[PDB]
């Protein structure tokens, strides 16, 4: 990973903190030492410091994925990355602890239209954050050509027919 992408990760963390703090001021949450969800006190003003820390790694993983591998296509591909790693973890823990079957034990195509939006929300967020800076990424006539190919095929067929007539 390059160093100004190292910058970009810190800038993303900062702006995610700014959006979360916008939510904090919108809902009127106030900081405190004690941890609780009903009394409206937070040690990092719901989220623990670890519980914001954890969102640091999946961005790096998805970014490595985009580096090793249009806009909506990359969005749904990052969303599929998220859902695939989520399904992998859930399947491993199910086969580990003997858990029951989940309704998400299906491929990404048969799935419903709602989880689509659920997994594309943050994908669109990080993609906005990506295009704000300037870094542009991608995946990494025809009729005339088809007509020409058909003509060549017809010529070959005519040659074959002439040969057959000779035979």
Task: Kindly list the distances between the CA atom of residue 73 and the CA atoms of 57, 76, 123, 137, in Å, as whole numbers in the listed order.
Answer: 22, 5, 11, 11
User: Measured between alpha carbons, how far is 142 from 149 in angstroms, rounded to an integer?
Assistant: 10
Beta bridge partners of 42: 31
How many residues make up the chain in this entry? Answer: 167
Experimental method: cryo-EM
User: Measured between alpha carbons, how far is 124 from 34 in angstroms, rounded to an integer?
Assistant: 35
Judge contact between 74 and 139, C-beta under 8 A. yes
């Amino acid at each position: 990973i390059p160093e100004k992408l190292e910058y970009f990760i810190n800038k993303y963390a900062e702006h995610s903190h700014d959006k979360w703090s916008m939510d904090k001021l919108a809902n009127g949450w106030i900081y405190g030492e004690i941890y609780s969800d009903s009394s409206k006190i937070q040690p990092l003003m719901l989220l623990s410091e670890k519980e914001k820390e954890i969102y640091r790694w999946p961005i790096k993983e998805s970014l490595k994925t985009m580096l090793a591998w249009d806009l909506h296509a990359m969005a749904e591909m990052m969303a599929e990355n998220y859902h695939n790693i989520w399904a992998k973890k859930k399947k491993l823990e199910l086969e580990s602890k003997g858990g029951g079957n989940h309704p998400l034990l299906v491929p990404y195509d048969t799935l419903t239209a709602k989880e689509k939006a659920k997994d594309r929300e943050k994908a669109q967020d990080i993609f906005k954050f990506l295009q704000i800076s300037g870094y542009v990424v991608s995946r990494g006539x025809x009729x005339x050509x088809x007509x020409x190919x058909x003509x060549x095929x017809x010529x070959x067929x005519x040659x074959x027919x002439x040969x057959x007539x000779x035979x």
